[PDB]
């Protein structure tokens, strides 16, 4: 049977509202006057007042912006009945899919991260890991996919790129030699987490690395 396709609506729409999504029709309307209605959560149960249908025209309406992180999907049913109240179709299932927008910034799991490493180690040696989460969708979009980088290092002794960070794992590593506890006991690294896999918004935290004996 031909059915009404799932309707995809990006969260945070600007309208105007009410917004026409799609128009229901029963082909028994050439003969008899038909009246349409909808049921399901959002329409005649909570959340309240999200959807409606125009009774005579069959236009399905969205009355308010949606939020994918609250509710990602709705299941409604369209009904078609004649004036005297007889059903003239089996109810039609109507799916609404709320698609993601990048409305969340990445957030580090803590404000300051600490770690350590021995003065001797070879380049490539793992030191510590930092983490940022992003509430957006990370499967179909990049809106929730975080890329990590080192904005800067202090002090720059013996030189400036003592460390690197893996852009997906957040693992910080040593990439140069000549760490000496007595000389420089502590580096301060400003680390950044950028959503849209590097193309989006950026959040900053600190990672302190202590050098050991």
């Amino acid at each position, epitope marked *: 049977d031909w059915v009404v396709a799932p309707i995809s609506v990006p969260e*945070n729409g*600007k*309208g*105007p*509202f*009410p917004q026409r999504l799609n128009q229901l029709k029963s082909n028994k309307d050439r003969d008899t006057k038909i009246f349409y*209605s*909808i*049921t399901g959560p959002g*329409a*005649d*149960s909570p*959340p*309240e*007042g999200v*959807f*409606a*249908v*125009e*009774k*005579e*025209t069959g236009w399905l*309406l969205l*009355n*308010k*912006p949606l939020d994918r992180e609250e509710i990602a999907k709705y299941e409604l049913f369209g009904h078609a009945v004649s004036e005297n109240g007889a059903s003239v179709e089996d109810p039609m299932n109507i799916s609404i899919i709320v698609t993601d927008q990048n409305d969340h910034k990445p957030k580090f799991t803590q404000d300051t991260f600490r770690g350590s490493v021995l003065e001797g180690v070879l380049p490539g040696t793992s030191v510590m890991q930092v983490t940022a989460t992003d509430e957006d969708d990370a499967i179909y979009t990049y809106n929730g996919v975080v890329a990590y980088s080192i904005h800067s290092q202090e002090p720059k002794d013996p030189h400036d790129l003592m460390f690197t960070i893996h852009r997906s794992t957040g693992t910080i590593s040593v990439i140069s030699s000549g760490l000496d506890r007595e000389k420089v006991p502590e580096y301060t690294l400003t680390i950044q987490a950028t959503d849209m896999d590097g193309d989006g918004s950026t959040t900053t935290a600190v990672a302190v690395v202590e050098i050991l004996d």
Partner: single-chain antibody
Amino acid sequence: QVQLQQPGTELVKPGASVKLSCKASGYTFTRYWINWVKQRPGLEWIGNIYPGSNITNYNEKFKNKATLTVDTSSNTAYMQLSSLTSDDSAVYYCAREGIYDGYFPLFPYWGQGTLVTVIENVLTQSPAIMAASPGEKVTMTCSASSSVSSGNFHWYQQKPGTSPKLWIYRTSNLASGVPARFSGSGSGTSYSLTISSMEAEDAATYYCQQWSGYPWTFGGGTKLE
């Protein structure tokens, strides 16, 4: 328990601006449209706002007078009126959406109003003033310059000193407190409200209301005695 509180009177001079407040409680403020309405010696829809996103719809008529805001932190809606004249002196109501049955919501929850002293579907209501005796049938009529869905045609009752009170919705459903004597009917462009047997209680100003795209409009009113 849905409540909208408005201060009640404000005195202002011509040309100044004023901000009216509508304090909400009993529900999550961000999720529900708030509408504003003007009344003078009939009723007019100014516009509405969805608080969570700060989205508005305006009646073209008040585009330049009215700007609607919200303060989420204090569950408060505001309407700023600019460059006041005597024409602006009126009662201003806030009203929250709506009825939840799968059709386009209306707004049955009104604040008690604040008193300021200084292209659409037109709804013609007749007669403007009528009188009857108890036991008698009473019927009244509303006609629209353009077609209206039976889902979007409503009636209100107002007695002096009180905010309007939803009476019939979607042509023929009786609102909560409303007695079986009342009945509505109509279709397309002609609608009516009917009382089988008049009663002392029932004396008041009745207003028809439609939506068919914005703006909401009202009839000029029918005053019953």
